[PDB]
Design a protein around this ligand. Sequence first.
Ligand SMILES: Nc1ncnc2c1ncn2[C@@H]1O[C@H](COP(=O)(O)OP(=O)(O)O)[C@@H](O)[C@H]1O
Ligand SMILES: Nc1ncnc2c1ncn2[C@@H]1O[C@H](COP(=O)(O)OP(=O)(O)O)[C@@H](O)[C@H]1O
Ligand SMILES: Nc1ncnc2c1ncn2[C@@H]1O[C@H](COP(=O)(O)OP(=O)(O)O)[C@@H](O)[C@H]1O
Ligand SMILES: Nc1ncnc2c1ncn2[C@@H]1O[C@H](COP(=O)(O)OP(=O)(O)O)[C@@H](O)[C@H]1O
Ligand SMILES: [Mg+2]
Ligand SMILES: [Mg+2]
Ligand SMILES: [Mg+2]
Ligand SMILES: [Mg+2]
Lengths: 49, 447, 433, 442, 443
Amino acid sequence: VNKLRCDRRPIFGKNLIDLLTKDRRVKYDKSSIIDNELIKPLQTRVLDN
Amino acid sequence: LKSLSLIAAHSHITGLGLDENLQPRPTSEGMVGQLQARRAAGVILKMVQNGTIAGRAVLVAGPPSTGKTALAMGVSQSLGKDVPFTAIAGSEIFSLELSKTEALTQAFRKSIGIKIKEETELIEGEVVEIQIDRSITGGHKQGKLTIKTTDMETIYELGNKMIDGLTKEKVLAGDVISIDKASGKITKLGRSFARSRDYDAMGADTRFVQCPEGELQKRKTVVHTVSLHEIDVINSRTQGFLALFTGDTGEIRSEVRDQINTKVAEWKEEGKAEIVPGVLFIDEVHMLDIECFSFINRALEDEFAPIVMMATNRGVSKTRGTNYKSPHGLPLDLLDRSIIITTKSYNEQEIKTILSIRAQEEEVELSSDALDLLTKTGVETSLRYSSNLISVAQQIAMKRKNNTVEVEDVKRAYLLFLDSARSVKYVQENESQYIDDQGNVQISIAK
Amino acid sequence: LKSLSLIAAHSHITGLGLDENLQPRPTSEGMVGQLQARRAAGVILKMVQNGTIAGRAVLVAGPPSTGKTALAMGVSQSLGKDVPFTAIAGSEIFSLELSKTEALTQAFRKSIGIKIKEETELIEGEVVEIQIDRSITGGHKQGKLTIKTTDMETIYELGNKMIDGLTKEKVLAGDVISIDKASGKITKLGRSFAFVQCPEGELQKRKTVVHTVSLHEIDVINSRTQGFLALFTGDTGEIRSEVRDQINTKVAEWKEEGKAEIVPGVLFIDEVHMLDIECFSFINRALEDEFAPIVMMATNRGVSKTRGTNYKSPHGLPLDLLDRSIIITTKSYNEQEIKTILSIRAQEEEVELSSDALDLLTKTGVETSLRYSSNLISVAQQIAMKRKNNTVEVEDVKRAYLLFLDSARSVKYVQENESQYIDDQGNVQISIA
Amino acid sequence: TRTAAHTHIKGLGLDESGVAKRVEGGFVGQIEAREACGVIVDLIKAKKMSGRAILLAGGPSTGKTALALAISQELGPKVPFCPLVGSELYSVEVKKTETLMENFRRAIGLRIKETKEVYEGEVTELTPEDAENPLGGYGKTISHVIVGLKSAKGTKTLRLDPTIYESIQREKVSIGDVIYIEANTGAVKRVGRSDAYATEFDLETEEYVPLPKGEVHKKKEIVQDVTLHDLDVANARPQGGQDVISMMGQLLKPKKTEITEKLRQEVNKVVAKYIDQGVAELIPGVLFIDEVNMLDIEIFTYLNKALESNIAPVVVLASNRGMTTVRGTEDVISPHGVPPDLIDRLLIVRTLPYDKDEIRTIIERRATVERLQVESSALDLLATMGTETSLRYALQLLAPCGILAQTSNRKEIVVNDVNEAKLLFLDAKRSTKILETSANYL
Amino acid sequence: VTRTAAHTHIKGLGLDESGVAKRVEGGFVGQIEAREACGVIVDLIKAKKMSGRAILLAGGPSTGKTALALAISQELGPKVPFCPLVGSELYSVEVKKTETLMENFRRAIGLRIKETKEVYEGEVTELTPEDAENPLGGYGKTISHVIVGLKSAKGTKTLRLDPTIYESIQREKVSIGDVIYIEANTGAVKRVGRSDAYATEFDLETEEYVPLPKGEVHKKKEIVQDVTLHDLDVANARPQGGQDVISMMGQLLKPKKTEITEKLRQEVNKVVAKYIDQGVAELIPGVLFIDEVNMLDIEIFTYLNKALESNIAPVVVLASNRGMTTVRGTEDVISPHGVPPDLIDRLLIVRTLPYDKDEIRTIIERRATVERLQVESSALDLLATMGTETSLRYALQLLAPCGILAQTSNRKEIVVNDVNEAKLLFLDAKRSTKILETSANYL
Ligand SMILES: Nc1ncnc2c1ncn2[C@@H]1O[C@H](COP(=O)(O)OP(=O)(O)O)[C@@H](O)[C@H]1O
Ligand SMILES: Nc1ncnc2c1ncn2[C@@H]1O[C@H](COP(=O)(O)OP(=O)(O)O)[C@@H](O)[C@H]1O
Ligand SMILES: Nc1ncnc2c1ncn2[C@@H]1O[C@H](COP(=O)(O)OP(=O)(O)O)[C@@H](O)[C@H]1O
Ligand SMILES: Nc1ncnc2c1ncn2[C@@H]1O[C@H](COP(=O)(O)OP(=O)(O)O)[C@@H](O)[C@H]1O
Ligand SMILES: [Mg+2]
Ligand SMILES: [Mg+2]
Ligand SMILES: [Mg+2]
Ligand SMILES: [Mg+2]
């Protein structure tokens, strides 16, 4: 059990899981615009056609 | 020592032989001669370490087996860790998946590094017991749990959202956990040693840890060293972190690149992230497409342009993608915005000193007359031809089980393995036996 | 109504400018000169409007800066809407993902349109009262609404889907709403008193809606289940020929039944002088099918070498198409014609020109290329703007001319300083000493 | 504080509607060239033309790219500007024509301005207002909902229509929590609990936000810009969480695809519809291409076709070659490698080599930029060297002299330092001579 | 019975303890210098010290180059990795040639891994969940532990398992009477099958039956499986875990080669170095062999220079037969053996000499003995003469149809008439060319 516990410990995330979200995190706020009506994604185009 | 200790071609060289006055010692740091080239390399290294200058291209020139690759390796070694150093070959950029221009862009982005620091407020500690009044009131009756450390222990009051979060990832006390002060994230670190004897077969996730020591909550800062290219790759894809290992980046668009540049500038202004200029080294750049040369010329004039060093052993020859021959194998416009460093062929004394240092590197002792014969052979032949002969002669001496390498062993090794000139002479003398350029060949000895 | 429009090369050209006798006017609809070429273009336009013929290929010729592309743009403008018109470049078909034959087939299919019309009832009126009967944690819900027009006013009981329809978008008494009964779409025509007049006449009326979709869209849709996304992302590859044959049969039987009508269009290829022999060979057979749009081809090259072959062919194309194609030639431009063209360009860009300035611009456009002056006019106006006067003078045009070089002058300067520039062999001199 | 062969150019160095000064904005000489560049800047600022192409040709190290950088600086950050290389267009993923069209669309930008009325503050209380129903019934009827908002330096209570009940129930916000309400659009958005309630618990997973400053009623105008290519790629690329196409984007590799013309024309139509209301404002950009001699003849033909479009922005081309052959054709010879038809469609701007005094001024200005000081004798020696070998060699040699002076603990460079640099560092001509005089394959 | 294909008669170089090659040994004759050089190379490989050393052997066709390249591998032993290669195989459609060369380079060097695992196995006698009566506030309903008894031939034993293993075995759908398999390390549970003791329980049964395992219940063992680093890189780049639907879709897709980044190789190198420092693993350098290197492009030749200077670069050997020729992908660069001069400078050259008439006769005798055929002395002499007249490989190939010809006449010996008939029925290259010179339509 000692060997198993010692071996199961050094499992390192190669970069991180917090680095990823910290680099995703955009300081720019929501700033809602008419872009919601301007984008019209693929699913909406499928639906309305 | 952290890397694999297999002995390679460039193992003896470590750092640069320069002093605080940038004066190269005749024999230091595993390098011999090339005083002017070593001084130029030290100047370039100081230029890189200054970090206030960018977008400079330096050329390394010299005949084959003169020390260009050795000089680049020594420069990288002297630069040390924590500073990016990308070493690629010219033919490597030719990729079926990625355009050559995009490959050059990625290579440039890899060579420049970034340090980012982050601060966290975490509360880590073993929990004593958790009590919730599910029957007295029911529905988040504001239960309480006690967290214990080796030096201190207190009692916390828990809200409704605390109970809802703790229901997921159920905790049965006696476990070491860490709670986030900002987002209130529940993280299970590991169980205590007291639970080690509960069963005889544990689960995959079962682990035991000691009780944390010190204050219940701490303020800590972490610094990460991530280069730009990783940032562009991660931002480009929903899960881009896999693309680093897999290598299928997918020709990242320039829009993401400029967004990343703006983000990096903003972080630098805020002081969260600092920029660490690096070094990009391209070996055997004599072979490359002209489009790559033009792209290099244009991209050398950007703020995030690492110092680029290239090597070439070719004279005035034809450049790939063009019919005409250009000097040094490169177009003249690139040569205009570049500095050329030339290396001269070694001397007999330099050759024998290098051979001695190589033999000492391979834990091989040599007789004086054996060293003199090896130097004499390497003067007529090339220097690189002598090291392989040295290794083979050591193997022969080990076969004979007689201590040091003798002159007879070296002579036998030279007899067994031929030089390029001898092979050319033998081929010319027996040109019928080998396959000619027209495909004609003679097999039968009898006429 | 008006799409994104900016002053471009062919902004002024709007229509051929032809009479009932198909005799071009000297100056009309932005077209000047080229009487025979304009007459031939009008003949082709009348043939296209007739729509009773197919598989006719016409090649226009002439030196650069002659108006062949302008002639094609005028043809497109005179063609009007409801008739497809596809303009592609010669190098556009060299696709890394799609075969050149497949790209040419797609270009051919895109030029033919199909019209299908249907009758959809419409209900439009002013809201009086909206009553929604819901149940919290109850599931089933009810609703009632009252609609009103100028002549009549009744209360309508809504279905389950109608409740969601009127609740997804806010609908009040002060709103004027038209709803299609079959479609279920809810439209807010405008806002009444909380400024649009209440709808008049009958509350419910039936109106006809026509959908126009080119045939290539039908091929893309029926190629695969996920092929609809390719109508926008353009990621479709090697549509099976059986699909095309079945679509052709369906279109033929639809036209026979009168359910739908086909509107043949015009496919225009610019700079056809560059292309592969495979493309020409495929075109030779593609022009012979029933659903072949009339193809207009432009080429300014002389007797040159067709790409993909060592030999040089006249007009830049192999004789196979030239046998089955019709050639329209274009001639150079007279000085007076150049002056009128420059004047119409100035009128398009609302730039005031001095008479002497116009005359010298005409003379320099006769000596140099016409495009040189047609570009220099805007720069001259910009320079004159710095003098705080809304009129271009001789001095402004001279300053613009000395500021910006012509091709011949630049060639002369390069020849005089060949050492400074980069030689074809790669040699170049950069040191002044 | 990093410089790379640039950043010493600050604008075109012109004056108020006149001939550019001798020295201004880090520019020396070539008055005609930058005067023409300023004319072009005025033309693009007019924002009326479409598909106007200019080309500048000259010898190497004659400020060809410097002028493009200068006009980019003069235009301003808001105006889009896309640098490009001749080798950029050769893409494995998609054909060159699609890449060129995508760059063209990326050159054009668009600006959006919006105004919003915001009622925000701490929720003091939520009290419904009862009234008699218009239709007879025993059920409770509510005519208005009373909401009180508290902020720094001001508090207020608002009477609203009772339909806000759904939004207030959805946001799960109760009391003493900052909320955001739009005037005409309605609806509410919870932003976080009031900071005063943070101490109410020993631990908390929910952040507490400070109360809004100023009045509860706010009127802020927001400006957002985006290029047309971003709109096109957003329209084409699917988005979503769990729809099948969403993770069909996953487990695969998203790659550039030839966007159809119907999508582009639909985007143009919706953009025109929005700009007819004054909300949008289209601003054309500038596309910069270097080493245009490296473009294929097919790309040249497609450029000829595309320059006549009604949305094509202003493009600027640079070439340092003269009487050469266009790539893709072994027999066609045209100046600067551009086919004659394309040359007929643009304007040629000449560039002239510099003189010794201009070279010396450039060197001294660069030295001032690099934050290092030289002597008059050393400066003259450097100017002579630049006039002898090349200007760029002298410019590159600056930093090694600074390093050598630093090693000698000196603050200013002397003749000895530049001599050490010249012996340590070689230029093109000496390297070529060494190659000619050596037979060791070097 | 036993198959022979131009090989399998070579068991090694055949060198004595002093390194002197015998005249005839291990299916080899002559080429004493080449055999001595190959033995020296074998000793260097077994030294496990040098890295990146490269040799090249050159000679005319049928001079034993491939034979030597196989004999060196045979002498090395199956433990040390040896990846044969041909210069043509590098060009791959999916990925660039450089990536393939690097992948083969990493395939060449190997590594062995030792780890200890303990396994509980045996027939399931009974299983019993144990539910604690105390809610404790932290959970609603869960089993405190599960007690399972295991039976095997040597004895029986009972176990106490946490809820995770119980959930796993419940997912495995195992009742009383099924032989199961418990791994202590990862908690892996797999159902081997139902014990054969219940075979007669029903007249027919879908389930297969397994005999009761040996060992008491619980065993301790270790695995010394040796795996090269390329497999590690592939596994890291292509994970097999996860039960997500996206993971299954990825598993369905075909495995396409990709340019593995240098960062991943660096991390693999770091963990391997840590393990080898801990003594849990041992690194064994291998040998990479490329045949017909003249087919390589100049780009691959250039990249070989950079590759050979790496730290973990193995020993690579090359084979070529051409002389003064032009490197592929170039225009006029004429270099010996079709190899650029810099690469030749980096490697060592080994020469292979042709064979004498007596040596050819001895080769024919040895080959015929290997094929288990009887050849008359006169017929063997005639075969040696005609092989010296045209080629050795022609005689070696003609050795086969002579056996069938003798069998047709039921004789068991090779007769001059049989070999003459075979020569009549089969023509060599020279006769074919001569008859091709004078013919109507390409013959
Ligand atoms: N200063 C030096 N001291 C010792 N050995 C050197 C030195 N310079 C070069 N070498 C030797 O030269 C070899 C590298 O030659 P290299 O420069 O790669 O040739 P090329 O110029 O063809 O790239 C190495 O094996 C190294 O041992
Ligand atoms: N009749 C005309 N009316 C208006 N513009 C014309 C006329 N003829 C030629 N042009 C102008 O000449 C230019 C070149 O003509 P076009 O056919 O478009 O290209 P090119 O002839 O150079 O291939 C166009 O910009 C067009 O505006
Ligand atoms: N007026 C000027 N003032 C200062 N530096 C200049 C000036 N003109 C050119 N330069 C220098 O010339 C360089 C630009 O070279 P450029 O002529 O664009 O190269 P290419 O000819 O290859 O395009 C810049 O690094 C800049 O330092
Ligand atoms: N010294 C030898 N002893 C026995 N057989 C040999 C010898 N040399 C060559 N051979 C035979 O020649 C055959 C082919 O030779 P190979 O080495 O493939 O030619 P190459 O050198 O052109 O590749 C092999 O099957 C091998 O058995
Ligand atoms: Mg090297
Ligand atoms: Mg035209
Ligand atoms: Mg430039
Ligand atoms: Mg062979």
